[PDB]
Amino acid sequence: PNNLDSNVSQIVLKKFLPGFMSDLVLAKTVDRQLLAGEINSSTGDSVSFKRP
């Protein structure tokens, strides 16, 4: 019998199998313009809007 398992090496390829993913819907639909660039942690923790 030939014991020649020390003549080869175990190789792990540099490839990644695909994973799972979700989708973004609610983020796109809501409005971001009114609240953008309006509150800063240094200034405070709250900003206000006026009702009609």
Binding site: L26, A27, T29, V30, D31, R32, L34, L35, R51
Partner: protein
Amino acid sequence: YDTTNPQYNSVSRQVEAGDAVSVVGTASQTMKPNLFYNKFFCGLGSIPLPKLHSIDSAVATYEGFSIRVHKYADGDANVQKMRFDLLPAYVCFNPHMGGQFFGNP
């Protein structure tokens, strides 16, 4: 239902004592709710965070969202580490412009 400021009424009559109410649903049902709303129902914002004092940093982008990454290390223990952060904020303009909808019988 304001009797001195009728301009801001939004309901036909006041809720007096003894008025009967009910809760929509089942005793212990669980489900995934459907949603319907208007553009100006809720608002979303991502506050940009500033750098730290003498720590390497960079900014990444992923669907219009900016995330700040910080890289630093511990000296004596000889360990390297990273961190990603984001700071959100929420508003609710008018609750009367959104809710949950389900198939009626």
